[PDB]
Amino acid sequence: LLKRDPLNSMMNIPAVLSRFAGKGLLLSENGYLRWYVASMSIGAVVVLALLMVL
Amino acid sequence: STEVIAHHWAFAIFLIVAIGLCCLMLVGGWFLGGRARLSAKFYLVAMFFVIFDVEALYLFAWSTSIRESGWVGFVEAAIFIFVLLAGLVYLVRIGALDWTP
């Protein structure tokens, strides 16, 4: 039951999570200038709202 | 005041009479009578006009208050106009300000 070293796999889990998160984040780098402007305006909205709620 | 509001009224009437005269002229023209790829040099010239127009606005603001700025203002306007003429010489010498090659 232990021959595959389960503790090593459970400690290897954060590497899998990092690879999945990086692959998911790289989808936003689609190369569209209009989406880049849209993301700038979205970030402006988020920053302004965060500054207003404190 | 009185003279300033009289002049405001006169200027507004001048505006509306001129515009109405032109529009009435075209309306009467339409009424009366019986019926039956450009080169980049244009862009460059217009762009040069824009840049030197903004620099001209700086000189416009300089020219009004000469006797309130002293000799330091003359010095600063002198570096301003020197960079102006340096850019003009740069444009002329490379062929930017020549319609024909």
Binding site: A44, L51, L54 | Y90
Partner: protein
């Protein structure tokens, strides 16, 4: 206006006179060698004249400008970045069939804007310095406009930087509407008794944060960075990544130092979230990158996140300014060497049609010393000890521990581990197996070798850099 104030202005005057002289020399004849030499002579002269400005002292040259040792340190970093850019640009521009001389004029004018941002003490001077480093970068990013990727990067950077300039200008206008004074020290002066967090002041600072965080590649204003870095010419990528980031973060450092609204808790929390997201996202997006330009763009996002972590600890700590100085020296040398190795392997410019892929795999077996420099900078940007990048990481960790910024400290550790993965992947790919000849290319190799030796020497022995950064003090 005093003549000592004229002594405080010498980097600005020397760079402007170099601009005029190089422009007139181009107007006389188009000589790449002579105009490039005149440009590097003017930049070297301004770097030398920083000593005379240091002997002049420290004073407020205008309601706009203020010069102290803080400003001279930032001016020196910007001038060194510009000199390295010109040195990398000459073997690059040797292959450029169009006019090779406008490059140096734009580089010099951008260095002038960097100097203005180094010395800026005023919203007008900050806006002017931002625009003076931006518009020549519009020209330089698309200097090879016939190349498809360079034209794409030029259009992207121009549109997005015009939008960010509009955001920054609108925020400045709202701040001036509240305050009635464009001086840095008056941004929050008319408030008091706990009424520091005025909503219009905070929203104006938020719009300025949007513009400057675009300029600093901070998440979520970061998506332009890999595309613009990949599409731009490699010396232009070097100049952007070093000079633009250093000058704008220096002026942001100064703005948050003297503005009384810099002690607002809301801006601190927003900048903490931005720093956290920048570190994590920039490290995570560079995991699976086979292109060194995009990888270095994501790396720049993470490193500006670390710098922002050092920025948040400004008011609570005391060593925050020194931390920013030491980190910026290490980052300048590291990014200079990295993008320089990329530049000399991308030199000469092969044309608009041919690919400009780096192909770092197997670099040691045909070009070994540059491979050694490249892996040294990979270790330095990873923050590994024996490198000055570690010394900067240690300073950032010290100011995060002293200010009890535990979330940002944990972000630094986790993003450091992810960075270790991708940086070590690049550094070991340099020594795997894969399937110039003038003195200017040798000068570029000299520049990257010198920067690598400096980062190694100040990794093992960091005390001179610490002492000379501590020598710089502002007019508090």
């Amino acid at each position: 206006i005093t003549p000592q104030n004229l002594i405080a202005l010498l980097p600005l005057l020397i760079v402007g006179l170099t601009v005029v002289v190089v422009m007139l020399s181009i107007a006389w004849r188009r000589n790449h060698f002579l105009n490039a030499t005149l440009s590097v002579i003017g930049l070297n002269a301004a770097l030398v004249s920083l000593w005379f400005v240091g002997q002049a002292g420290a004073m407020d040259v205008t309601p706009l400008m203020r010069v102290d040792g803080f400003a001279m340190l930032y001016t020196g970093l910007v001038l060194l970045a510009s000199l390295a850019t010109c040195t990398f640009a000459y073997p690059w521009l040797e292959g450029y069939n169009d006019n090779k001389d406008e490059f140096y004029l734009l580089v010099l004018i951008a260095a002038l804007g960097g100097i203005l941002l180094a010395n800026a003490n005023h919203l007008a001077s900050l806006f002017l310095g931002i625009e003076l480093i931006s518009l020549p970068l519009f020209g330089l990013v698309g200097y090879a406009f016939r190349q498809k990727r360079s034209l794409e990067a030029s259009i992207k950077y121009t549109i997005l930087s015009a939008a960010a300039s509009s955001f920054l200008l609108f925020g400045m206008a709202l701040v001036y509407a509240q305050s009635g004074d464009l001086s840095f020290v008056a941004l929050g002066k008319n408030l008091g008794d706990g009424m520091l967090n005025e909503p219009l002041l905070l929203a104006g600072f938020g719009l300025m944060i949007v513009g400057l965080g675009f300029k600093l590649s901070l998440v979520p204003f970061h998506l332009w960075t890999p595309d613009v870095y990949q599409g731009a010419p490699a010396p232009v990528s070097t100049f952007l990544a070093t000079a633009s980031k250093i000058a704008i973060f220096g002026v942001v450092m100064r703005l948050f130092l003297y503005a009384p609204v810099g002690d607002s808790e809301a801006i601190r929390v927003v900048l903490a979230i931005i720093a956290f997201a920048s570190i994590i996202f920039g490290n995570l997006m560079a995991l699976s990158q086979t292109n060194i330009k995009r990888l270095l763009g994501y790396s720049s996002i993470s490193h500006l996140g670390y710098l922002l972590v050092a920025l948040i600890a400004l008011q609570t700590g005391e060593m925050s300014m020194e931390a920013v100085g030491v980190y910026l020296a290490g980052y300048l040398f590291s990014s200079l060497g990295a993008f320089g190795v990329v530049s000399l392997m991308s030199s000469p410019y092969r044309g608009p049609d041919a690919d400009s892929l780096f192909s770092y795999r197997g670099l040691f077996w045909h070009r070994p010393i540059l491979a050694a420099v490249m892996t040294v900078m990979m270790l330095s940007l990873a923050g590994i000890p024996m490198t000055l990048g570690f010394i900067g990481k240690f300073y950032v960790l010290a100011v995060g521990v002293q200010a009890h910024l535990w979330w940002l400290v944990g972000a630094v550790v986790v993003g450091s581990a992810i960075g270790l993965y991708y940086y070590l992947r690049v550094a070991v790919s340099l020594y795997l197996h894969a399937p110039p000849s003038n003195w200017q290319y040798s000068a570029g190799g000299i520049v990257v070798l010198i920067s690598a030796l400096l980062v190694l020497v100040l990794g093992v022995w960091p005390q001179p850099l610490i002492s000379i950064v501590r020598l710089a003090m502002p007019l508090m």
